[PDB]
Each structure stands twice: as C-alpha cells, then as structure tokens.
C-alpha cells in the first residue's frame, strides 16, 4: 500500500510534467500510469503461479528471514 501511494505521488509528479511541455527524450523510458487493480490482475495471471509455488521452502529461508525476525520481534 505504501509503495503504491508513493507511485501515485510519482504519477502526480509525472503528470505535472505532462500537463506543460516536458517531452520524453529516451523513447524507451515510458511508464504507464499506476493503478493497482490491473497490476494485481496481471500478477494473478502471469506470475502468481510461479510466485506462490511452495517448493521446498528454499525461497522463504532465502528472502523472508529479515521480515521473519522483525515480525517475531514486534
């Protein structure tokens, strides 16, 4: 949620440029405006299967231990 509100702050900033001049130079830096629902949808379709795969418990011990210890502390 917080990263999303940040991306909407950024969308506000970018639209501020877009309302008055500010043409893009690098023709490959375009970003579509951020709206959660559609990306949650594409997350569901394209990458939710690979993501939510339980596997052998490796990704959990790999990446989440920081948050694990943090949540245990809190």
């Amino acid at each position: 949620r917080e990263l999303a509100t940040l991306l909407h702050m950024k969308d506000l900033e970018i639209q501020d440029y877009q309302e008055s001049g500010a043409t893009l130079i690098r023709d490959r830096l375009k970003t579509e405006p951020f709206e959660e629902n559609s990306f949650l949808e594409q997350f569901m379709i394209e990458k939710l299967p690979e993501a939510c795969s339980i596997g052998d418990g490796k990704p959990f011990v790999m990446n989440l231990q920081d948050l694990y210890m943090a949540v245990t502390t809190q």
Binding site: I25, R26, D27, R28
Partner: protein, 142 residues
C-alpha cells in the same frame, strides 16, 4: 556528425561504426553522459544511424549499460563483427531500370512496365590504357 555534414554528394545511407569495449563510457561525470544521450538522439534524428560491435573485454560485455538507448542478449564478442571479415568481392547496382517500355494489351490499352534485370553475367571491369612511365590516361583517338 560534422564529417557527414561536410561532403557534398548526396548520401543514400549513413552509418557510424564505433569500436570500443568500455561499455560505460564514463561512470564518473554524469553530465558528460547526459550530453551524450542528447547529442546521440539528435544524430538519430538528423538521419544518421549509429552502431557498435562489442569487441572484447574481461567482464564489461553488456549493452544495457548506457548503450541500449544508442544503437538500433550479450556476450564478450560480437558476431556482428565476424561477418565484416567475410572478405567478399561482389559488386552491386541499385534498383536500376534497364528500360521502361509501355506494355499495350491491344492498340488502345497500354500499361507501364519496367524491364528490370535479375542476372547479368558480370565481366571484369574494362581496363584503361595507360602511358608506360607516366601512368597517365592516354585518351584513344581512333
């Protein structure tokens, strides 16, 4: 860019070949790199293409580092430079209409046909007669 601008004959295609492997030209002065994108984008819009073949480097063999926006996955040597050694002696002529003739179905219906050539049996270029010491042209006068 100035070099291309200088010469007077009209140019069909305009290509620039870099030869470098410092895949980041400078990670030190960002202003130089910003001006680099600017000028390169300009050249892309003045009618000039640009191209690099990643020659060879210990590591540092990537194109997304500052060059994905320049040229038109990756490795340490370019296949694109190997063919530039294929060392050929062909010769070519462009889309050269041998003769345009008006195909007429009858005495009234006429259509425009360009008789073109697709095989020609190239001969050796015709030799030129030269003076024996002076190597000058001799301007035959039969």
């Amino acid at each position: 860019a100035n070099l291309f601008s200088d010469v007077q004959f009209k140019m069909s295609h305009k290509r620039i070949m870099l030869f470098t492997n410092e895949d980041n030209p400078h990670g030190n002065d960002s202003a130089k790199a910003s001006r680099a994108r600017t000028k390169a984008g300009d050249l892309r819009d003045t009618g000039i293409f640009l191209d690099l073949m990643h020659l060879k480097k210990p590591g540092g063999f990537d194109i997304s580092l500052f060059y994905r926006d320049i040229i038109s996955v990756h490795f340490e040597e370019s296949s694109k430079l190997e063919d530039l050694l294929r060392k050929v002696r062909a010769k070519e002529t462009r889309k050269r209409a041998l003769s345009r003739l008006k195909l007429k179905l009858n005495k009234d219906i006429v259509i425009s046909v360009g008789i073109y050539n697709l095989v020609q049996k190239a001969l050796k270029p015709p030799p030129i007669k030269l003076y024996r010491e002076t190597n000058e042209p001799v301007k035959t006068k039969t």
